[PDB]
Amino acid sequence: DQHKAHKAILAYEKGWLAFSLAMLFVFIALIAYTLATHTAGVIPAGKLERVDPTTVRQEGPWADPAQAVVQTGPNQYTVYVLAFAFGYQPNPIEVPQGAEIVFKITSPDVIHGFHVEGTNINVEVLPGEVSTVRYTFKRPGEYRIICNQYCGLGHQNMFGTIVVKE
């Protein structure tokens, strides 16, 4: 009792740390599950795709809004998205429902975010580098793109639209 107190209490320390490690690993488990499913598609790609942000809206696939969506499989689209000081090229992004969409996004100025309301598309856009995520919209409608990385005073106004065709 004040030293018996000790002997107990330090055994609990052991049981709480055991339980804790257990629960923690179950979490590691259920993350693991997600990386194996389709949902893992939102994770940005490893490979360093270098581009030159000063040249990007002149030459390459980010130079022409008309050419942003480019069929890349029987059920696949690559979208070249430009995130810039203070909206999105193209606008809207029209994509068919059911299809794998491969967003390839970059910026000509400062870092942006490209986050799509109601999806787990949530990525940082860095000048000089291509952010590559994939997604399949399971139902049609308009999806608002919010820019969630501070980039200057137009920040609170940077929104885009994705139209996913019926």
Partner: protein
């Protein structure tokens, strides 16, 4: 005395909060997937 049971009810609330948050956010993640 014996059992530090006040401290157990503390770590119990802590465990539950941890599970409501992680399970709630897991469910949202799937629903947007």
């Amino acid at each position: 005395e014996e059992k530090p049971k006040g401290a157990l009810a503390v770590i119990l609330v802590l465990t539950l909060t941890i599970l409501v948050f992680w399970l709630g956010v897991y469910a949202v993640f799937f629903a947007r997937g």
